[PDB]
Amino acid sequence: HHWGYGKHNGPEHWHKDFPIAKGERQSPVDIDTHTAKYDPSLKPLSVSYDQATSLRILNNGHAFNVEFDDSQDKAVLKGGPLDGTYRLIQFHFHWGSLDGQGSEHTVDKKKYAAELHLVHWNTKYGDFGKAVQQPDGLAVLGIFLKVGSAKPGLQKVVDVLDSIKTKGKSADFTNFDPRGLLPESLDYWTYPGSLTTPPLLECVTWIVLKEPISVSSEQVLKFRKLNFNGEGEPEELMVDNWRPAQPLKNRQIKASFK
Numbered sequence: 001h002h003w004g005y006g007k008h009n010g011p012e013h014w015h016k017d018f019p020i021a022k023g024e025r026q027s028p029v030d031i032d033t034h035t036a037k038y039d040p041s042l043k044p045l046s047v048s049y050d051q052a053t054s055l056r057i058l059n060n061g062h063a064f065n066v067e068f069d070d071s072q073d074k075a076v077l078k079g080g081p082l083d084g085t086y087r088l089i090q091f092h093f094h095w096g097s098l099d100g101q102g103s104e105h106t107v108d109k110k111k112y113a114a115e116l117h118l119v120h121w122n123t124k125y126g127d128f129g130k131a132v133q134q135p136d137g138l139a140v141l142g143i144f145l146k147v148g149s150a151k152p153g154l155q156k157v158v159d160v161l162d163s164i165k166t167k168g169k170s171a172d173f174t175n176f177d178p179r180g181l182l183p184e185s186l187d188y189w190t191y192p193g194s195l196t197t198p199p200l201l202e203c204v205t206w207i208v209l210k211e212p213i214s215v216s217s218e219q220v221l222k223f224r225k226l227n228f229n230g231e232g233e234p235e236e237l238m239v240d241n242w243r244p245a246q247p248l249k250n251r252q253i254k255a256s257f258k
């Protein structure tokens with residue numbers, strides 16, 4: 001009876017195993033665009049993905065992760081609200097059963113069809129497992145997906161999903177360039193928060209881009225063909241793998257733009 005996104009094990013239940021679910025810096029949140037304060041002291045973000053080394057794509061039963069070699073400073077996030085160097089470890093998405101839901105963060109209560117999370121850890125802590133124990137351990141770049149024109153740089157991901165339909169399946173996934181998933185603008189909102197999945201650790205500096213990327217209806221339809229279940233188990237489509245907005249509590253969302 002482990003955690004998931006069902007009626008019986010979904011986000012409203014998580015606090016029984018993970019009491020930090022009701023903590024002071026949980027994610028995601030609604031971004032109230034009128035209340036977010038422009039912070040002229042924030043820097044431009046530095047996304048340095050030219051030497052990124054993708055390795056593998058995994059269906060872990062709650063999403064699919066594209067994993068990177070994070071044993072050296074190849075794909076790093078710096079600048080913006082961040083102190084020091086954060087190494088890309090994986091990206092994944094959250095999405096809906098229909099185009100009107102799927103994102104974890106919302107913007108003036110608007111839900112996007114999906115949300116991409118590029119997960120990075122602070123090199124001062126040496127490894128990901130140590131970094132998630134620190135209040136400045138992770139930096140997650142969040143990007144909203146809307147349905148419209150196809151995203152060219154997403155198609156290599158969509159094309160391999162048939163090979164990882166069920167929980168525990170993986171495939172080689174080399175030479176993938178995450179720069180093809182970024183919007184034109186790096187204008188962002190930032191706030192201190194948490195992992196949006198158990199163990200819900202309060203270790204994340206969130207950096208959520210204002211400009212969504214456009215994906216095609218066919219691209220997101222292929223996400224919705226994945227399965228939460230393992231091979232030979234009753235089919236449960238991997239949809240609505242999003243946690244809803246959590247209380248902002250004693251936090252300020254800052255904007256990088258006027």
Ligand SMILES: Oc1c(Cl)cc(Cl)cc1Sc1cc(Cl)cc(Cl)c1O
Pocket residue numbers: 128129132195197198199201
């Ligand atoms: O082994 C882990 C590391 Cl290095 C970091 C984190 Cl945040 C969690 C684990 S194990 C783990 C994985 C998932 Cl998907 C959910 C839970 Cl509740 C876990 O403890």
Ligand SMILES: Oc1c(Cl)cc(Cl)cc1Sc1cc(Cl)cc(Cl)c1O
Pocket residue numbers: 150151152153155156157159
């Ligand atoms: O090369 C591409 C073109 Cl002409 C249009 C779009 Cl919308 C995506 C791509 S990227 C790509 C994706 C896969 Cl699955 C295979 C190959 Cl040979 C690609 O170049």
Ligand SMILES: [Zn+2]
Pocket residue numbers: 092093094117196
């Ligand atoms: Zn996520």
